Short mmCIF file of N, CA, C and O in Angstrom, two decimals:
data_model
loop_
_atom_site.label_atom_id
_atom_site.label_comp_id
_atom_site.label_asym_id
_atom_site.label_seq_id
_atom_site.Cartn_x
_atom_site.Cartn_y
_atom_site.Cartn_z
N UNK G 500 -13.57 5.82 6.94
CA UNK G 500 -12.14 5.87 6.69
C UNK G 500 -11.80 5.26 5.33
O UNK G 500 -10.96 5.79 4.60
N UNK G 501 -12.46 4.16 4.98
CA UNK G 501 -12.24 3.56 3.67
C UNK G 501 -12.64 4.53 2.55
O UNK G 501 -11.93 4.64 1.54
N UNK G 502 -13.76 5.23 2.72
CA UNK G 502 -14.19 6.20 1.72
C UNK G 502 -13.22 7.38 1.64
O UNK G 502 -12.89 7.84 0.55
N UNK G 503 -12.77 7.87 2.80
CA UNK G 503 -11.81 8.97 2.81
C UNK G 503 -10.51 8.58 2.13
O UNK G 503 -9.84 9.42 1.53
N UNK G 504 -10.13 7.30 2.24
CA UNK G 504 -8.92 6.84 1.59
C UNK G 504 -8.94 7.14 0.09
O UNK G 504 -8.01 7.76 -0.44
N UNK G 505 -10.02 6.75 -0.59
CA UNK G 505 -10.09 6.93 -2.04
C UNK G 505 -9.94 8.39 -2.44
O UNK G 505 -9.26 8.72 -3.41
N UNK G 506 -10.58 9.29 -1.68
CA UNK G 506 -10.56 10.70 -2.04
C UNK G 506 -9.15 11.27 -1.92
O UNK G 506 -8.69 12.01 -2.80
N UNK G 507 -8.44 10.94 -0.83
CA UNK G 507 -7.12 11.50 -0.56
C UNK G 507 -6.11 10.37 -0.29
O UNK G 507 -5.89 9.93 0.84
N UNK G 508 -5.49 9.88 -1.35
CA UNK G 508 -4.43 8.89 -1.23
C UNK G 508 -3.51 8.96 -2.45
O UNK G 508 -3.97 9.08 -3.59
N UNK G 509 -2.21 8.88 -2.19
CA UNK G 509 -1.22 9.20 -3.22
C UNK G 509 -1.23 8.17 -4.35
O UNK G 509 -1.07 8.53 -5.52
N UNK G 510 -1.43 6.90 -4.02
CA UNK G 510 -1.33 5.80 -4.98
C UNK G 510 0.04 5.79 -5.64
O UNK G 510 0.20 6.07 -6.83
N UNK G 511 1.05 5.49 -4.82
CA UNK G 511 2.45 5.56 -5.25
C UNK G 511 2.70 4.74 -6.51
O UNK G 511 3.66 5.02 -7.24
N UNK G 512 1.86 3.74 -6.78
CA UNK G 512 2.08 2.89 -7.95
C UNK G 512 2.08 3.69 -9.24
O UNK G 512 2.94 3.50 -10.10
N UNK G 513 1.12 4.60 -9.40
CA UNK G 513 1.12 5.45 -10.59
C UNK G 513 2.07 6.62 -10.43
O UNK G 513 2.55 7.18 -11.43
N UNK G 514 2.38 7.01 -9.19
CA UNK G 514 3.21 8.19 -8.97
C UNK G 514 4.67 7.92 -9.34
O UNK G 514 5.36 8.82 -9.83
N UNK G 515 5.15 6.70 -9.10
CA UNK G 515 6.54 6.38 -9.42
C UNK G 515 6.77 6.43 -10.93
O UNK G 515 7.83 6.86 -11.40
N UNK G 516 5.77 6.00 -11.71
CA UNK G 516 5.88 6.09 -13.16
C UNK G 516 5.99 7.54 -13.61
O UNK G 516 6.82 7.88 -14.47
N UNK G 517 5.17 8.42 -13.03
CA UNK G 517 5.26 9.84 -13.37
C UNK G 517 6.60 10.42 -12.96
O UNK G 517 7.17 11.25 -13.68
N UNK G 518 7.12 10.00 -11.81
CA UNK G 518 8.42 10.48 -11.36
C UNK G 518 9.51 10.10 -12.36
O UNK G 518 10.34 10.93 -12.75
N UNK G 519 9.54 8.82 -12.76
CA UNK G 519 10.56 8.37 -13.70
C UNK G 519 10.42 9.07 -15.05
O UNK G 519 11.41 9.47 -15.66
N UNK G 520 9.18 9.23 -15.51
CA UNK G 520 8.93 9.94 -16.76
C UNK G 520 9.45 11.37 -16.68
O UNK G 520 10.10 11.86 -17.61
N UNK G 521 9.18 12.06 -15.57
CA UNK G 521 9.62 13.44 -15.42
C UNK G 521 11.14 13.54 -15.37
O UNK G 521 11.72 14.46 -15.95
N UNK G 522 11.79 12.60 -14.69
CA UNK G 522 13.25 12.60 -14.65
C UNK G 522 13.84 12.41 -16.04
O UNK G 522 14.77 13.13 -16.44
N UNK G 523 13.30 11.46 -16.80
CA UNK G 523 13.80 11.22 -18.15
C UNK G 523 13.58 12.44 -19.03
O UNK G 523 14.45 12.83 -19.81
N UNK G 524 12.40 13.07 -18.92
CA UNK G 524 12.12 14.25 -19.73
C UNK G 524 13.04 15.40 -19.34
O UNK G 524 13.49 16.16 -20.20
N UNK G 525 13.35 15.54 -18.05
CA UNK G 525 14.28 16.57 -17.63
C UNK G 525 15.66 16.36 -18.23
O UNK G 525 16.27 17.31 -18.74
N UNK G 526 16.17 15.13 -18.17
CA UNK G 526 17.49 14.87 -18.72
C UNK G 526 17.51 15.09 -20.23
O UNK G 526 18.45 15.67 -20.78
N UNK G 527 16.45 14.64 -20.92
CA UNK G 527 16.36 14.86 -22.36
C UNK G 527 16.31 16.35 -22.69
O UNK G 527 16.94 16.80 -23.65
N UNK G 528 15.54 17.12 -21.91
CA UNK G 528 15.45 18.54 -22.16
C UNK G 528 16.76 19.26 -21.94
O UNK G 528 17.13 20.14 -22.71
N UNK G 529 17.49 18.88 -20.89
CA UNK G 529 18.81 19.47 -20.66
C UNK G 529 19.76 19.14 -21.81
O UNK G 529 20.50 20.01 -22.29
N UNK G 530 19.75 17.89 -22.27
CA UNK G 530 20.62 17.50 -23.37
C UNK G 530 20.29 18.27 -24.64
O UNK G 530 21.19 18.78 -25.32
N UNK G 531 19.00 18.37 -24.98
CA UNK G 531 18.63 19.07 -26.21
C UNK G 531 18.87 20.56 -26.07
O UNK G 531 19.17 21.25 -27.06
N UNK G 532 18.77 21.10 -24.85
CA UNK G 532 19.16 22.49 -24.62
C UNK G 532 20.63 22.69 -24.92
O UNK G 532 21.01 23.67 -25.57
N UNK G 533 21.47 21.76 -24.46
CA UNK G 533 22.89 21.86 -24.78
C UNK G 533 23.12 21.82 -26.29
O UNK G 533 23.86 22.65 -26.83
N UNK G 534 22.46 20.88 -26.98
CA UNK G 534 22.62 20.76 -28.42
C UNK G 534 22.21 22.04 -29.13
O UNK G 534 22.87 22.49 -30.07
N UNK G 535 21.10 22.65 -28.69
CA UNK G 535 20.71 23.95 -29.22
C UNK G 535 21.76 25.01 -28.90
O UNK G 535 21.93 25.97 -29.65
N UNK G 536 22.46 24.85 -27.77
CA UNK G 536 23.46 25.84 -27.39
C UNK G 536 24.68 25.81 -28.30
O UNK G 536 25.28 26.85 -28.57
N UNK G 537 25.08 24.62 -28.78
CA UNK G 537 26.21 24.62 -29.71
C UNK G 537 25.82 25.14 -31.09
O UNK G 537 26.69 25.35 -31.94
N UNK G 538 24.53 25.33 -31.35
CA UNK G 538 24.08 25.77 -32.67
C UNK G 538 24.65 27.15 -33.02
O UNK G 538 25.11 27.33 -34.16
N UNK G 539 24.65 28.14 -32.12
CA UNK G 539 25.28 29.43 -32.48
C UNK G 539 26.76 29.34 -32.77
O UNK G 539 27.31 30.26 -33.38
N UNK G 540 27.44 28.27 -32.35
CA UNK G 540 28.90 28.22 -32.47
C UNK G 540 29.36 28.29 -33.92
O UNK G 540 30.40 28.88 -34.21
N UNK G 541 28.59 27.71 -34.84
CA UNK G 541 29.06 27.57 -36.21
C UNK G 541 29.19 28.90 -36.94
O UNK G 541 29.80 28.96 -38.01
N UNK G 542 28.62 29.98 -36.40
CA UNK G 542 28.63 31.25 -37.12
C UNK G 542 30.05 31.79 -37.22
O UNK G 542 30.41 32.45 -38.20
N UNK G 543 30.88 31.53 -36.20
CA UNK G 543 32.22 32.10 -36.19
C UNK G 543 33.05 31.61 -37.37
O UNK G 543 33.93 32.31 -37.86
N UNK G 544 32.76 30.39 -37.85
CA UNK G 544 33.52 29.84 -38.97
C UNK G 544 33.32 30.67 -40.23
O UNK G 544 34.23 30.76 -41.07
N UNK G 545 32.15 31.28 -40.39
CA UNK G 545 31.89 32.07 -41.58
C UNK G 545 32.68 33.37 -41.59
O UNK G 545 32.89 33.97 -42.65
N UNK G 546 33.12 33.84 -40.42
CA UNK G 546 33.84 35.11 -40.34
C UNK G 546 35.14 35.06 -41.13
O UNK G 546 35.48 36.01 -41.84
N UNK G 547 35.88 33.96 -41.01
CA UNK G 547 37.15 33.82 -41.72
C UNK G 547 37.04 32.78 -42.83
O UNK G 547 36.19 31.89 -42.77
N UNK N 500 -36.73 -26.23 42.27
CA UNK N 500 -35.28 -26.20 42.09
C UNK N 500 -34.89 -26.74 40.72
O UNK N 500 -34.02 -26.20 40.05
N UNK N 501 -35.55 -27.83 40.29
CA UNK N 501 -35.29 -28.33 38.95
C UNK N 501 -35.69 -27.31 37.89
O UNK N 501 -34.96 -27.11 36.91
N UNK N 502 -36.83 -26.65 38.07
CA UNK N 502 -37.25 -25.63 37.11
C UNK N 502 -36.25 -24.48 37.05
O UNK N 502 -35.89 -24.01 35.97
N UNK N 503 -35.79 -24.01 38.22
CA UNK N 503 -34.81 -22.93 38.26
C UNK N 503 -33.50 -23.34 37.61
O UNK N 503 -32.88 -22.56 36.88
N UNK N 504 -33.06 -24.58 37.86
CA UNK N 504 -31.86 -25.09 37.20
C UNK N 504 -32.04 -25.11 35.69
O UNK N 504 -31.09 -24.85 34.94
N UNK N 505 -33.25 -25.41 35.22
CA UNK N 505 -33.54 -25.27 33.80
C UNK N 505 -33.39 -23.83 33.35
O UNK N 505 -32.86 -23.55 32.27
N UNK N 506 -33.86 -22.88 34.17
CA UNK N 506 -33.83 -21.47 33.78
C UNK N 506 -32.40 -20.94 33.75
O UNK N 506 -31.96 -20.34 32.76
N UNK N 507 -31.65 -21.15 34.84
CA UNK N 507 -30.34 -20.52 35.01
C UNK N 507 -29.28 -21.61 35.24
O UNK N 507 -28.95 -21.97 36.37
N UNK N 508 -28.73 -22.11 34.14
CA UNK N 508 -27.60 -23.03 34.17
C UNK N 508 -26.87 -22.95 32.84
O UNK N 508 -27.49 -22.99 31.77
N UNK N 509 -25.54 -22.85 32.91
CA UNK N 509 -24.75 -22.54 31.73
C UNK N 509 -24.80 -23.67 30.70
O UNK N 509 -24.61 -23.43 29.51
N UNK N 510 -25.06 -24.89 31.15
CA UNK N 510 -25.02 -26.08 30.29
C UNK N 510 -23.64 -26.20 29.64
O UNK N 510 -23.46 -26.03 28.44
N UNK N 511 -22.65 -26.47 30.50
CA UNK N 511 -21.24 -26.42 30.11
C UNK N 511 -20.95 -27.21 28.84
O UNK N 511 -19.99 -26.90 28.13
N UNK N 512 -21.76 -28.23 28.54
CA UNK N 512 -21.50 -29.08 27.39
C UNK N 512 -21.50 -28.27 26.10
O UNK N 512 -20.62 -28.45 25.24
N UNK N 513 -22.47 -27.37 25.93
CA UNK N 513 -22.50 -26.54 24.73
C UNK N 513 -21.56 -25.35 24.87
O UNK N 513 -21.11 -24.79 23.86
N UNK N 514 -21.26 -24.94 26.10
CA UNK N 514 -20.41 -23.76 26.30
C UNK N 514 -18.96 -24.06 25.95
O UNK N 514 -18.25 -23.18 25.45
N UNK N 515 -18.50 -25.28 26.20
CA UNK N 515 -17.11 -25.62 25.90
C UNK N 515 -16.87 -25.59 24.39
O UNK N 515 -15.82 -25.14 23.93
N UNK N 516 -17.85 -26.05 23.61
CA UNK N 516 -17.72 -25.98 22.16
C UNK N 516 -17.65 -24.53 21.69
O UNK N 516 -16.84 -24.19 20.83
N UNK N 517 -18.50 -23.67 22.26
CA UNK N 517 -18.48 -22.26 21.88
C UNK N 517 -17.15 -21.61 22.23
O UNK N 517 -16.62 -20.81 21.45
N UNK N 518 -16.60 -21.94 23.40
CA UNK N 518 -15.34 -21.32 23.81
C UNK N 518 -14.18 -21.80 22.95
O UNK N 518 -13.31 -21.01 22.57
N UNK N 519 -14.16 -23.10 22.61
CA UNK N 519 -13.13 -23.60 21.70
C UNK N 519 -13.25 -22.95 20.33
O UNK N 519 -12.24 -22.56 19.72
N UNK N 520 -14.48 -22.83 19.83
CA UNK N 520 -14.72 -22.17 18.55
C UNK N 520 -14.23 -20.73 18.58
O UNK N 520 -13.62 -20.24 17.62
N UNK N 521 -14.50 -20.02 19.68
CA UNK N 521 -14.07 -18.64 19.81
C UNK N 521 -12.55 -18.53 19.80
O UNK N 521 -11.99 -17.63 19.18
N UNK N 522 -11.86 -19.45 20.50
CA UNK N 522 -10.40 -19.45 20.44
C UNK N 522 -9.89 -19.68 19.02
O UNK N 522 -8.96 -19.01 18.57
N UNK N 523 -10.49 -20.64 18.31
CA UNK N 523 -10.05 -20.92 16.95
C UNK N 523 -10.24 -19.70 16.07
O UNK N 523 -9.35 -19.32 15.30
N UNK N 524 -11.40 -19.05 16.18
CA UNK N 524 -11.68 -17.87 15.36
C UNK N 524 -10.74 -16.73 15.72
O UNK N 524 -10.29 -15.99 14.85
N UNK N 525 -10.41 -16.59 17.01
CA UNK N 525 -9.50 -15.53 17.42
C UNK N 525 -8.11 -15.73 16.85
O UNK N 525 -7.49 -14.78 16.35
N UNK N 526 -7.61 -16.97 16.90
CA UNK N 526 -6.28 -17.23 16.34
C UNK N 526 -6.28 -17.03 14.83
O UNK N 526 -5.32 -16.48 14.27
N UNK N 527 -7.34 -17.47 14.15
CA UNK N 527 -7.44 -17.24 12.72
C UNK N 527 -7.45 -15.75 12.41
O UNK N 527 -6.81 -15.30 11.45
N UNK N 528 -8.19 -14.97 13.21
CA UNK N 528 -8.24 -13.54 12.99
C UNK N 528 -6.89 -12.87 13.19
O UNK N 528 -6.52 -11.98 12.44
N UNK N 529 -6.15 -13.29 14.21
CA UNK N 529 -4.82 -12.72 14.43
C UNK N 529 -3.88 -13.07 13.28
O UNK N 529 -3.12 -12.21 12.81
N UNK N 530 -3.91 -14.32 12.81
CA UNK N 530 -3.05 -14.71 11.70
C UNK N 530 -3.39 -13.93 10.43
O UNK N 530 -2.50 -13.46 9.72
N UNK N 531 -4.69 -13.79 10.14
CA UNK N 531 -5.08 -13.05 8.94
C UNK N 531 -4.78 -11.56 9.11
O UNK N 531 -4.48 -10.87 8.12
N UNK N 532 -4.83 -11.04 10.34
CA UNK N 532 -4.40 -9.67 10.59
C UNK N 532 -2.92 -9.49 10.26
O UNK N 532 -2.54 -8.49 9.64
N UNK N 533 -2.08 -10.44 10.67
CA UNK N 533 -0.67 -10.36 10.33
C UNK N 533 -0.47 -10.42 8.81
O UNK N 533 0.35 -9.68 8.25
N UNK N 534 -1.20 -11.31 8.14
CA UNK N 534 -1.08 -11.42 6.69
C UNK N 534 -1.50 -10.12 6.01
O UNK N 534 -0.90 -9.71 5.01
N UNK N 535 -2.53 -9.45 6.54
CA UNK N 535 -2.93 -8.16 6.00
C UNK N 535 -1.87 -7.10 6.28
O UNK N 535 -1.64 -6.20 5.46
N UNK N 536 -1.22 -7.17 7.44
CA UNK N 536 -0.18 -6.21 7.78
C UNK N 536 1.00 -6.32 6.82
O UNK N 536 1.62 -5.31 6.47
N UNK N 537 1.33 -7.54 6.40
CA UNK N 537 2.50 -7.72 5.55
C UNK N 537 2.26 -7.21 4.13
O UNK N 537 3.19 -7.15 3.32
N UNK N 538 1.02 -6.86 3.80
CA UNK N 538 0.64 -6.51 2.43
C UNK N 538 1.36 -5.27 1.89
O UNK N 538 1.95 -5.35 0.80
N UNK N 539 1.36 -4.12 2.58
CA UNK N 539 1.89 -2.90 1.94
C UNK N 539 3.40 -2.87 1.78
O UNK N 539 3.94 -1.80 1.45
N UNK N 540 4.11 -3.98 1.99
CA UNK N 540 5.57 -3.95 1.98
C UNK N 540 6.12 -3.70 0.58
O UNK N 540 7.24 -3.20 0.42
N UNK N 541 5.35 -4.05 -0.46
CA UNK N 541 5.87 -4.00 -1.82
C UNK N 541 6.02 -2.57 -2.33
O UNK N 541 6.50 -2.34 -3.45
N UNK N 542 5.60 -1.59 -1.52
CA UNK N 542 5.71 -0.20 -1.94
C UNK N 542 7.18 0.18 -2.14
O UNK N 542 7.51 0.93 -3.07
N UNK N 543 8.07 -0.33 -1.29
CA UNK N 543 9.50 -0.08 -1.49
C UNK N 543 9.98 -0.68 -2.80
O UNK N 543 10.73 -0.03 -3.54
N UNK N 544 9.57 -1.91 -3.09
CA UNK N 544 9.94 -2.53 -4.36
C UNK N 544 9.49 -1.67 -5.53
O UNK N 544 10.20 -1.55 -6.54
N UNK N 545 8.32 -1.05 -5.41
CA UNK N 545 7.88 -0.10 -6.43
C UNK N 545 8.78 1.13 -6.47
O UNK N 545 9.13 1.61 -7.56
N UNK N 546 9.17 1.66 -5.31
CA UNK N 546 9.84 2.96 -5.26
C UNK N 546 11.21 2.92 -5.92
O UNK N 546 11.53 3.75 -6.77
N UNK N 547 12.05 1.96 -5.53
CA UNK N 547 13.43 1.96 -6.01
C UNK N 547 13.51 1.40 -7.42
O UNK N 547 12.50 1.01 -8.00
#
């Protein structure tokens, strides 16, 4: 059982760090996606 | 009869020490079992 533990065990200690990293990267990606989205807006100013 | 008593007699004097020792070891084992049980509690502290 001790040997089986090592092979298949989540080790939440490292998993929580990955979770927080992924959440931060998701929020950053959404924000930078928004910033890229306002980029097309400036073209309308050139029309007039 | 003396020879048989030599062969088959518990010799309570040494048996009482063994039984007291066994009780002490059992209580120590139960306490250390509880201490081991309390170990995985910090996983919540990690999670939140």
